[model samples]
Target: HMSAPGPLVFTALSPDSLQLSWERPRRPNGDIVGYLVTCEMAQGGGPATAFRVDGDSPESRLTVPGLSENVPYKFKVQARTTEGFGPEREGIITIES
Candidate 1:
Protein backbone atom coordinates (compact mmCIF):
# COMPACT_ATOMS: atom_id res chain seq x y z
CA HIS A 1 0.00 0.00 0.00
CA MET A 2 1.10 3.59 -0.59
CA SER A 3 -0.20 4.73 2.75
CA ALA A 4 1.72 3.94 5.98
CA PRO A 5 -0.16 5.28 8.98
CA GLY A 6 1.26 5.71 12.51
CA PRO A 7 0.15 7.09 15.87
CA LEU A 8 1.71 10.21 17.47
CA VAL A 9 1.92 9.19 21.11
CA PHE A 10 3.45 12.09 23.02
CA THR A 11 3.60 14.34 26.08
CA ALA A 12 3.20 18.13 25.76
CA LEU A 13 2.54 21.27 27.78
CA SER A 14 2.60 25.01 27.32
CA PRO A 15 5.73 27.15 27.94
CA ASP A 16 7.71 23.89 27.98
CA SER A 17 8.69 21.18 25.59
CA LEU A 18 6.84 18.30 23.91
CA GLN A 19 8.23 14.92 22.96
CA LEU A 20 6.77 12.15 20.80
CA SER A 21 7.61 8.79 19.27
CA TRP A 22 6.03 6.41 16.76
CA GLU A 23 6.73 3.28 14.71
CA ARG A 24 6.40 4.09 11.02
CA PRO A 25 4.94 1.59 8.62
CA ARG A 26 7.39 -0.34 6.44
CA ARG A 27 5.05 -1.22 3.59
CA PRO A 28 6.25 1.29 1.04
CA ASN A 29 9.59 1.71 2.87
CA GLY A 30 10.92 4.86 1.19
CA ASP A 31 7.38 5.81 0.22
CA ILE A 32 6.35 6.44 3.82
CA VAL A 33 8.47 9.42 4.95
CA GLY A 34 8.56 12.72 6.81
CA TYR A 35 6.64 13.96 9.89
CA LEU A 36 4.52 17.00 10.72
CA VAL A 37 4.67 18.14 14.35
CA THR A 38 1.97 20.58 15.50
CA CYS A 39 1.42 22.49 18.72
CA GLU A 40 -1.17 24.98 19.98
CA MET A 41 -2.04 26.92 23.15
CA ALA A 42 -5.77 27.19 22.69
CA GLN A 43 -8.57 24.74 23.32
CA GLY A 44 -12.14 24.18 22.00
CA GLY A 45 -11.44 25.98 18.67
CA GLY A 46 -8.35 27.73 17.31
CA PRO A 47 -5.57 27.59 14.76
CA ALA A 48 -2.87 25.00 15.58
CA THR A 49 0.52 25.86 14.11
CA ALA A 50 2.61 22.97 12.77
CA PHE A 51 6.33 22.46 12.28
CA ARG A 52 7.14 19.65 9.88
CA VAL A 53 10.49 17.90 9.59
CA ASP A 54 11.91 15.12 7.47
CA GLY A 55 11.83 11.60 8.90
CA ASP A 56 15.42 10.49 9.44
CA SER A 57 14.59 6.79 9.78
CA PRO A 58 11.71 4.29 9.65
CA GLU A 59 10.83 5.30 13.23
CA SER A 60 10.13 8.91 14.31
CA ARG A 61 10.98 10.98 17.36
CA LEU A 62 10.22 14.67 17.93
CA THR A 63 10.19 17.51 20.42
CA VAL A 64 8.88 21.08 20.17
CA PRO A 65 10.23 24.25 21.75
CA GLY A 66 8.93 27.77 22.60
CA LEU A 67 5.66 26.64 24.12
CA SER A 68 3.81 28.09 27.08
CA GLU A 69 4.17 25.71 30.04
CA ASN A 70 1.18 24.16 31.80
CA VAL A 71 -1.23 24.67 28.89
CA PRO A 72 -3.41 22.46 26.74
CA TYR A 73 -2.35 21.39 23.25
CA LYS A 74 -2.92 18.80 20.55
CA PHE A 75 -0.48 16.89 18.29
CA LYS A 76 -0.70 14.92 15.07
CA VAL A 77 1.62 12.88 12.84
CA GLN A 78 1.22 12.18 9.12
CA ALA A 79 3.05 9.83 6.80
CA ARG A 80 3.87 11.33 3.39
CA THR A 81 4.60 9.47 0.21
CA THR A 82 4.82 9.86 -3.56
CA GLU A 83 1.11 9.05 -3.75
CA GLY A 84 0.09 11.75 -1.19
CA PHE A 85 -0.29 12.41 2.51
CA GLY A 86 -1.86 9.69 4.60
CA PRO A 87 -4.41 10.21 7.36
CA GLU A 88 -3.07 11.89 10.51
CA ARG A 89 -3.47 10.49 14.03
CA GLU A 90 -4.45 13.48 16.16
CA GLY A 91 -4.88 13.84 19.92
CA ILE A 92 -4.63 16.28 22.83
CA ILE A 93 -1.86 16.43 25.51
CA THR A 94 -1.30 18.58 28.59
CA ILE A 95 1.84 19.26 30.74
CA GLU A 96 3.81 21.91 32.61
CA SER A 97 6.72 24.18 31.72
Candidate 2:
Protein backbone atom coordinates (compact mmCIF):
# COMPACT_ATOMS: atom_id res chain seq x y z
CA HIS A 1 0.00 0.00 0.00
CA MET A 2 1.14 3.52 -0.76
CA SER A 3 1.68 5.94 2.07
CA ALA A 4 0.83 9.60 1.82
CA PRO A 5 3.42 12.33 1.88
CA GLY A 6 3.75 13.13 5.56
CA PRO A 7 4.35 16.18 7.69
CA LEU A 8 3.46 19.05 5.39
CA VAL A 9 5.10 22.42 6.05
CA PHE A 10 4.14 25.84 4.78
CA THR A 11 4.61 29.60 5.09
CA ALA A 12 2.25 32.43 4.37
CA LEU A 13 3.82 34.68 1.76
CA SER A 14 0.95 37.16 2.03
CA PRO A 15 -2.80 37.23 2.27
CA ASP A 16 -2.88 36.37 -1.42
CA SER A 17 -0.23 33.67 -1.52
CA LEU A 18 1.61 30.92 0.36
CA GLN A 19 4.69 28.72 0.08
CA LEU A 20 4.65 24.98 0.82
CA SER A 21 7.00 22.02 0.93
CA TRP A 22 7.09 18.41 2.08
CA GLU A 23 9.08 15.19 2.22
CA ARG A 24 8.71 12.30 -0.19
CA PRO A 25 6.55 9.49 1.06
CA ARG A 26 8.30 7.63 3.87
CA ARG A 27 6.82 4.35 2.65
CA PRO A 28 6.44 5.06 -1.02
CA ASN A 29 4.65 2.17 -2.67
CA GLY A 30 6.25 2.78 -6.05
CA ASP A 31 8.11 5.32 -8.13
CA ILE A 32 6.88 8.74 -7.20
CA VAL A 33 6.26 10.76 -10.32
CA GLY A 34 4.33 13.77 -9.05
CA TYR A 35 2.34 15.46 -6.34
CA LEU A 36 -1.00 17.22 -6.09
CA VAL A 37 -1.38 20.15 -3.74
CA THR A 38 -4.79 21.46 -2.88
CA CYS A 39 -5.80 24.50 -0.85
CA GLU A 40 -9.30 25.34 0.19
CA MET A 41 -11.22 27.49 2.66
CA ALA A 42 -11.33 25.64 5.98
CA GLN A 43 -15.06 26.02 6.25
CA GLY A 44 -15.61 24.97 2.64
CA GLY A 45 -17.24 28.14 1.28
CA GLY A 46 -14.61 29.59 -1.06
CA PRO A 47 -13.02 28.52 -4.29
CA ALA A 48 -10.34 25.88 -3.85
CA THR A 49 -6.97 25.92 -5.58
CA ALA A 50 -5.10 22.87 -6.86
CA PHE A 51 -1.54 22.71 -8.11
CA ARG A 52 0.40 19.81 -9.56
CA VAL A 53 4.14 19.40 -9.12
CA ASP A 54 5.77 16.82 -11.35
CA GLY A 55 9.09 15.07 -10.75
CA ASP A 56 10.69 12.27 -8.78
CA SER A 57 12.58 13.47 -5.72
CA PRO A 58 12.83 13.75 -1.96
CA GLU A 59 12.28 17.53 -1.91
CA SER A 60 9.36 19.50 -3.30
CA ARG A 61 7.90 23.00 -3.06
CA LEU A 62 5.03 25.08 -4.36
CA THR A 63 3.61 28.57 -4.05
CA VAL A 64 -0.16 28.93 -3.92
CA PRO A 65 -1.87 32.11 -5.05
CA GLY A 66 -5.25 33.88 -5.20
CA LEU A 67 -6.18 33.35 -1.60
CA SER A 68 -8.53 35.65 0.30
CA GLU A 69 -7.19 37.56 3.27
CA ASN A 70 -7.89 36.44 6.82
CA VAL A 71 -9.55 33.26 5.74
CA PRO A 72 -8.66 29.93 7.32
CA TYR A 73 -7.56 27.22 4.89
CA LYS A 74 -6.84 23.55 4.76
CA PHE A 75 -3.92 22.36 2.67
CA LYS A 76 -3.68 18.82 1.34
CA VAL A 77 -0.62 17.18 -0.16
CA GLN A 78 -0.77 13.87 -1.97
CA ALA A 79 1.87 11.77 -3.66
CA ARG A 80 1.49 10.11 -7.06
CA THR A 81 3.23 6.87 -7.83
CA THR A 82 3.33 4.70 -10.92
CA GLU A 83 0.45 2.67 -9.52
CA GLY A 84 -1.74 5.58 -8.50
CA PHE A 85 -2.14 8.28 -5.84
CA GLY A 86 -1.46 7.80 -2.17
CA PRO A 87 -3.26 9.22 0.84
CA GLU A 88 -3.17 12.91 1.74
CA ARG A 89 -1.26 14.90 4.29
CA GLU A 90 -3.40 17.67 5.72
CA GLY A 91 -2.56 20.92 7.53
CA ILE A 92 -4.32 24.18 8.26
CA ILE A 93 -3.58 27.89 8.66
CA THR A 94 -5.31 31.24 8.48
CA ILE A 95 -4.27 33.69 5.78
CA GLU A 96 -3.25 37.15 6.95
CA SER A 97 -2.50 40.44 5.31
- TM-score of each model, in listed order: 0.69, 0.88
Candidate 2, residue 51: lDDT: 86
Top candidate, metric TM-score: 2
lDDT of 2 at 73: 82
CA displacement after TM-score superposition, residue 52 of candidate 1 (Å): 1.8
- C-alpha RMSD in Å of predicted model 2 compared with the true structure: 1.9
Worst 10 residues of 2 by lDDT: 1-10
Candidate achieving the largest lDDT: 2
lDDT of 1 by residue, 1-97 (tens): 3244455566653346767776675454446557666666547475677877686465687877665655667776667665666666675667654
Q: How does each model score on lDDT?
A: 0.63, 0.82
Candidate 2 has a TM-score of 0.88
Q: Which stretches of candidate 1 lie over 4 Å from their true place?
A: 1-5, 11-15, 26-30, 42-47
TM-score (C-alpha, index-matched) for candidate 1? 0.69
Tens-digit per-residue lDDT, 1-97, candidate 2: 2388867777889878878888888898778899988899889877788888898578788888887677888899889778888889888877765
Model 2: pairs clashing at backbone N, Cα or C within 3 Å: none
